[PDB]
């Protein structure tokens, strides 16, 4: 019930697709991942890489986090990601999100979990 590690997996992992397929991807995913349950989560990123590859970022480039903490890591390589963002025409419970597909280096915070 929810460990920090399982929570990251639920909110950001989507290894079953190489990339967002349509404009409706964020709407279906935000929902099935239970991100629109209580409210509408405003912003969320989905990574389309294997779990192992995403876990491997924690052994990659050490960088400072936006808060000053230094447990952040940047992937050496670019990864397939999908940015999900609430539109201005979104309202609980009719959550609407704009899907933006991209290939970027991801930055994650890691914990010896």
């Amino acid at each position: 019930k929810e460990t920090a590690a399982a929570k990251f997996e639920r909110q950001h992992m989507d290894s079953s697709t190489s990339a967002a397929s349509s404009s409706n991807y964020c709407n279906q995913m935000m929902k099935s991942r239970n991100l629109t349950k209580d409210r509408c989560k405003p912003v969320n990123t989905f990574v389309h890489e294997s779990l192992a590859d995403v876990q491997a970022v924690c052994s990659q480039k050490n960088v400072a986090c936006k808060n000053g903490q230094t447990n952040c890591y940047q992937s050496y390589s670019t990864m397939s990601i999908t940015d999900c963002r609430e539109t201005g025409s979104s309202k609980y419970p009719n959550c609407a999100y704009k899907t933006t597909q991209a290939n970027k280096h991801i930055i994650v915070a890691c914990e010896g979990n």
Binding site: Q11, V47, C110, E111
Partner: peptide, 11 residues
């Protein structure tokens, strides 16, 4: 082990 707990950024 040492695993991702938060998605900070992209690029």
């Amino acid at each position: 082990p040492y695993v991702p707990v938060h998605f900070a950024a992209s690029v």
